[PDB]
Every structure is written in C-alpha cells, then in structure tokens.
Design a protein around this motif. Structure first.
Motif, PDB file in Angstrom:
ATOM      1  N   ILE B 133       0.735  -1.009  -0.191  1.00  0.00           N
ATOM      2  CA  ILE B 133      -0.028  -0.191  -0.246  1.00  0.00           C
ATOM      3  C   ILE B 133       1.275   1.360   0.175  1.00  0.00           C
ATOM      4  N   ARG B 134       0.505   2.072  -0.840  1.00  0.00           N
ATOM      5  CA  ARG B 134       1.592   3.781  -1.655  1.00  0.00           C
ATOM      6  C   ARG B 134       0.755   4.355  -0.581  1.00  0.00           C
ATOM      7  N   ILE B 135       1.263   5.537   0.912  1.00  0.00           N
ATOM      8  CA  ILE B 135       0.409   6.285   1.024  1.00  0.00           C
ATOM      9  C   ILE B 135       0.813   7.985   0.847  1.00  0.00           C
ATOM     10  N   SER B 136      -0.169   8.742   1.308  1.00  0.00           N
ATOM     11  CA  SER B 136       0.137  10.256   0.450  1.00  0.00           C
ATOM     12  C   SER B 136      -0.390  10.822   0.960  1.00  0.00           C
ATOM     13  N   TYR B 137       0.071  12.338   1.472  1.00  0.00           N
ATOM     14  CA  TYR B 137      -0.517  13.340   2.113  1.00  0.00           C
ATOM     15  C   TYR B 137       0.494  14.049   1.439  1.00  0.00           C
ATOM     16  N   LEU B 140       4.378  14.286   1.335  1.00  0.00           N
ATOM     17  CA  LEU B 140       5.044  13.195   1.673  1.00  0.00           C
ATOM     18  C   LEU B 140       3.808  12.082   1.387  1.00  0.00           C
ATOM     19  N   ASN B 141       4.712  11.162   0.142  1.00  0.00           N
ATOM     20  CA  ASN B 141       4.510  10.198  -0.789  1.00  0.00           C
ATOM     21  C   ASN B 141       5.191   8.833  -0.602  1.00  0.00           C
ATOM     22  N   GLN B 142       4.990   8.026   0.323  1.00  0.00           N
ATOM     23  CA  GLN B 142       5.810   6.369   1.014  1.00  0.00           C
ATOM     24  C   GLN B 142       5.243   5.259   0.116  1.00  0.00           C
TER      25      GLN B 142
HETATM   26  C1  LIG Z   1       4.791   9.838  -5.519  1.00  0.00           C
HETATM   27  O1  LIG Z   1       6.101   9.744  -5.803  1.00  0.00           O
HETATM   28  C2  LIG Z   1       6.247   9.478  -7.196  1.00  0.00           C
HETATM   29  C3  LIG Z   1       7.834   8.934  -7.626  1.00  0.00           C
HETATM   30  O2  LIG Z   1       8.276   7.311  -6.881  1.00  0.00           O
HETATM   31  C4  LIG Z   1       5.284   9.638  -8.335  1.00  0.00           C
HETATM   32  O3  LIG Z   1       5.834   9.334  -9.516  1.00  0.00           O
HETATM   33  C5  LIG Z   1       3.693   9.252  -7.500  1.00  0.00           C
HETATM   34  O4  LIG Z   1       3.199  10.934  -8.382  1.00  0.00           O
HETATM   35  C6  LIG Z   1       4.003  10.351  -6.292  1.00  0.00           C
HETATM   36  N1  LIG Z   1       2.584  10.026  -6.044  1.00  0.00           N
HETATM   37  C7  LIG Z   1       1.537  11.343  -6.158  1.00  0.00           C
HETATM   38  C8  LIG Z   1       0.065  11.126  -5.611  1.00  0.00           C
HETATM   39  O5  LIG Z   1       2.631  12.592  -6.867  1.00  0.00           O
END
Ligand SMILES: *[C@@H]1O[C@H](CO)[C@@H](O)[C@H](O)[C@H]1NC(C)=O
Lengths: 53, 437
Positions: B133-137, B140-142
C-alpha cells in the motif's frame, strides 16, 4: 530456450462484442477468460487463418 | 487520531480519503494498492515421478534344481523356469536338455532426475494474504508493506495505520493441488495408500529421501521363447509421462478473478475481490490549522461538456471570492461521481478547474472545498463509442438522480396521474359525507 512469437492478431472491436482475425504460421493456442465471477474459460488450437467473435 | 475507512480491492485505482477534524484545516489522503498476493498453506502429502524397471541379467544353470528366494524390494515377480534351450553367437552352451534352470527377476526404482523432474502434491487451507500500500498526503508520499491481517501496524512515519481483515477468503485454490514447474492444477489425486495401475501416481513415494517407493505398476513375467535367451516382461507405460503429454487446461487460465499464479512460494497475485477496511491515527502536527488561507466565501459550479464513462470528461468551473491565496482541500461527499485532483493551489482570481467522472447522465455530486460545500449538477448526456484498453476509474453505480433534468417529466406525469385518483377519492369522500346524514 528460445520460443517463437506469433504476429499480432487483427482486432476490430464492435459494440459489446470483440472480433479478431488470426493469421497463424504454425499451430498455436488462443485462450480467453472473463474477469467476472464466472470465468468461462476457453482453449482451441489454431492451424489456419480464422475469424473469432 | 483514530479514523476508519474502506478501500475497494481494485489495483491501480487511486482512492481519496478525507479527514475533517475540527480545529484544523481538513486534509485528504491518496491511497494506492500495488499487487496483492494471497499465499496458502502447504502440506506435501507425497511425491510422484517416473519409474525405471531394473532387471538384472538372467541366471543360467544346467542342473535342474530351482532356487526361489524372496527379498524386500517392491513388486517382485519371483519365478524360475525349466525346459530352456538357450542360444548365443557360438550356437549354444552345455549339452543337457529337459533339465535346465532359467532364473528371471525384475523390480522397479525411482527415476534418475527425481531430484529435479518431480511433481508435488499439496493440501490447501485458510490462507493469509499480503498487500503493498502506498500512502500520500501533504509533502509526504511513501510505499508501505503490511500483512493486512486481522490486526497489524504499518508506521509509515508520523502517522500509524492498521489494515483490517478481508471480509471473505474467496481463494481460487481448494483442498488439494499439484505443483509442477510453474503451473498448478485443481485436479485431485488418489491417496498415498493405494493408486490405480497406470492413470496417475503409479509411484506414490514420500519426500525425496527415497524411502519405501510404493509401487502398484503390476509387473508380469512370461516364459521366454525357445529360440534364444530372453527376459519377457510386460508393463504399462508410465502415468507421469502420459499425464504430462495430455496436460491441458492450465489453472493459470481458470482464475475466477484473473489472479496470476507464481510458483516459487506458490502465491496468487493481482486480482480483485472484496474490500479492505483500515483504521489510522495521525499526529496533530501533520497538517495546518484553520487560520491558514480561509478563502471560501460563496460558491457556485458550472459545466461546459460532460462526455463521461471512460477516464475523465467532467471539466467543471468553480469561482469564488478569495482571501490571501494559498493551498486548500477539495473532494466530494458522495460517490456517484469521483474526482482526480488532490489538494490544489488557489489563486486570487478564484477561477478553478476540476476534472471528475461518473456513469449516470444526471450526476448529483456534492463538491466540498476545505470550508464550503455546494450542490453541483450536470446533464452529462453524451457517451462515447469506443472499447477502451485502459482501466475504469469510477464506481459502477449508475442511477439517474432523484431530481434530475431528463427524468423529471416521468415524475410529474406519475404525480399527476396519482393526483387524478386522489382528487377522485376526495370527491367521493365529500359525496359520502353528504349522503351519510
Ligand atoms: C509519489 O512519488 C512517485 C515517485 O516515486 C510519483 O511517481 C508519484 O506520482 C507520487 N505520488 C503523487 C500522488 O504524486
């Protein structure tokens, strides 16, 4: 272990229906399934040109 | 700050999760699911492989006395014959006739490539499944890695997440399966005890340590012909080779949800079923407060063209008076229509473009800026004539809105046709109240 790669099948999509033309060079295999709950599998060997809907 | 949410188990679909705690600016979470993997339990009943019929050279002795001996190797055919007159290149040996011995014996043993060319049987049971699962706010995007079991933490960073258990385990596997060089089958097998002579598993050996190679391959001996030396043994062909030859109908093409199978630990990946609950807690200092960029004032929405149902055709215009420009949050309360834009920058002009999508021709999606909320409606009549090769990005719910703009005349004609009989009931009631007297 090398293995051949057949030509791209000729797709001509309809509406709620998919028509494809197959131009085999050797007897190969074509299979399809549905992502829905009932898969409805299929397999059938091909040796000559044929259309499938 | 604990909060709960649900995520459809569809790979490649961004999910928007809104948190609207008071005392701070509301915030939005981007959720991504990448390649789930269900892994079952394995039992390893026994093994199956080819068999070699080992026969020693026949024993010859010209005295007539028979020597029948029994050993512990599998499926011996202990038999010795008399009245044999063998021949070789030098014509023949010895002189005596009608008094001779001919000892012939054979047995069976496992194959030479048993270490590599074997086939494995396994028993399936309740299966765990892992998900990435990938979480972003905000800034912060991990990615993460959780077992999404009944209860387990993630700790991606300042916040912490716990993915709930699956509603139901609709595992493609069931009971007993067979693994053989990168493919499985939902084909049952006879038990380790007894097996049919020839069909499959005529050799039902246990683990590869080569102990007690049980065989029911039914060796048979016969009298050699009077011509020369022989060793006539009759045997059915190996069921392992025949099963490989017939094979057919690989399970990788029978997955009820397109769930691709990889054999190294034997798991099934990249398939959609059910939905995953989740809970979370967030530190207070992970976002901004209400004092930063409050610029909602009034609000209204407009739509230019709404060709829908493929990826995103809902271009929408939102204008509103603005305070000092800055960031903010935007989403939709309902799920009849879904948007793609995350938290977006706001300029002093106030003209903001939005991309959304839906299925029904009369959406009633209620947009919501980080402080305001106004109803938005559109006449998304026009479909498009294609069969897309990419993924859908909206809920399957298609339903004209209760208010609507094209189905209104149905509502009014139904109401009027009801009104006729309602007024008829009223006039009947007044008449019967007059006549009751
Ligand atoms: C999170 O980072 C990746 C790069 O590894 C990028 O491709 C992705 O678009 C980013 N997420 C968002 C929601 O922008």
């Amino acid at each position: 272990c090398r293995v051949p790669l057949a030509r791209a099948p000729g797709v001509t999509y309809g509406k709620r229906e998919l028509t494809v033309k197959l131009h085999p060079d050797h007897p190969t295999l074509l299979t399809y399934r549905s992502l829905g709950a009932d898969p409805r599998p299929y397999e059938e060997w091909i040796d000559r040109y044929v259309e499938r809907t | 700050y604990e909060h709960t949410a649900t995520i459809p188990n569809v790979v490649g679909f961004p999910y928007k999760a809104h948190i609207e705690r008071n005392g701070f600016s509301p915030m939005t979470l981007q959720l991504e699911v990448l390649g789930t993997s269900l892994e079952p339990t394995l039992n390893l009943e026994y093994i199956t492989c080819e068999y070699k019929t080992v026969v020693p050279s026949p024993y010859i002795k010209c005295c007539g006395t028979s020597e029948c001996r029994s050993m512990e190797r599998p499926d011996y055919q202990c038999q010795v014959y008399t009245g044999v007159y063998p021949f070789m290149w030098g014509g023949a040996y010895c002189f005596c006739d009608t008094e001779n011995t001919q000892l012939s014996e054979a047995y069976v043993d496992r194959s030479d490539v048993c270490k590599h060319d074997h086939a494995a049987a396994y028993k399936a049971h309740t299966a765990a499944m892992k998900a990435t699962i990938r979480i972003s706010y905000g800034n912060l995007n991990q990615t993460t890695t959780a077992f999404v079991n009944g209860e387990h933490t993630v700790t991606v960073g300042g916040s912490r997440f716990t993915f709930g258990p699956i509603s139901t385990a609709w595992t493609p596997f069931d009971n007993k399966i067979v693994v053989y060089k990168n493919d499985v089958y939902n084909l049952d097998f006879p038990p380790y005890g007894s097996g049919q002579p020839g069909r499959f598993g005529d050799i039902q050996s246990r683990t590869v340590e080569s102990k007690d190679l049980y065989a029911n391959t039914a060796l048979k001996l016969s009298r050699p012909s009077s011509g020369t030396v022989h060793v006539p043994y009759t045997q059915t062909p190996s069921g392992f080779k025949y099963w490989i030859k017939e094979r057919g109908t690989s399970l990788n093409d029978k997955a009820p949800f397109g769930c691709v199978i990889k054999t190294n630990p034997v798991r099934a990946e990249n398939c959609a079923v059910g939905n995953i609950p989740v809970s979370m807690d967030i530190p207070d200092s992970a976002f901004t407060r209400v004092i930063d960029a409050p610029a909602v004032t009034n609000l209204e929405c407009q739509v230019a063209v709404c060709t829908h149902s493929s990826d995103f055709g809902g271009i929408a215009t939102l204008t509103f008076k603005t305070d000092k420009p800055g960031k903010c949050a935007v989403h939709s309360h309902s799920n009849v229509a879904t948007i793609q834009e995350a938290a977006v920058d706001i300029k002093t002009d106030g003209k903001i473009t939005l991309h959304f999508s839906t299925a029904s021709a009369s959406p009633a999606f209620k947009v919501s800026v980080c402080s305001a909320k106004t109803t938005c409606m559109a006449a998304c009549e026009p479909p498009k004539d294609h069969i897309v090769p990419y993924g859908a990005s909206h809920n399957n719910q298609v339903f004209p809105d209760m208010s609507g703009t094209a189905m209104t005349w149905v509502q009014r004609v139904a109401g009027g046709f009801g009104g006729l009989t309602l007024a008829a009931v009223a006039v009947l009631i007044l008449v019967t109240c007059v006549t009751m007297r």
